[PDB]
Design a protein around this ligand. Sequence first.
Ligand SMILES: COc1ccc(C2=CCNCC2)cc1
Length: 182
Amino acid sequence: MGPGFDFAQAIMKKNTVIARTEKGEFTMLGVYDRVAVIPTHASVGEIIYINDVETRVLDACALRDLTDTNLEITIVKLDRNQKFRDIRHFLPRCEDDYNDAVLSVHTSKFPNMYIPVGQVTNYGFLNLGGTPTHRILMYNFPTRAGQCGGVVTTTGKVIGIHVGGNGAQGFAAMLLHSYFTD
Ligand SMILES: COc1ccc(C2=CCNCC2)cc1
């Protein structure tokens, strides 16, 4: 509908795949080369389905901060014959608040879904499903099951991936440029 949805659509059309684990279908963001991200609660194993194709996992790392606190991001390297468009220059360098964000989802159940979530707060600490979690972004939209892995963007920035909700608010794990240096 407008330039927010334009940037979101550009990311979804080239830099997302549908990931399936034993815990469900997730929106998965490809960041560069064969490296993608997914919420840690997806429980990635040695094998994952990517757009319904059986795919070997070459590496999977559940990130924690230097307090040894959960970040709810898993970085996955996929054994596939192609590379993602490099979108690392759209990642923020520092923790921040944002205006006018879009949450975008693409699964079998919710294809081509875009949600204007509005203002995003650097919330920080969250007890997420019983697990102390840091670097959480919060938005005042009543997000429901099926939206985990959803990409949070502003115009020109990919800022997070959706990891939970409380029925009234939705929560995303930050993406930082420093997670994807090689
Ligand atoms: C490293 O694994 C990859 C990389 C890219 C893809 C994509 C397929 C179609 N649309 C673009 C993204 C799939 C798997």
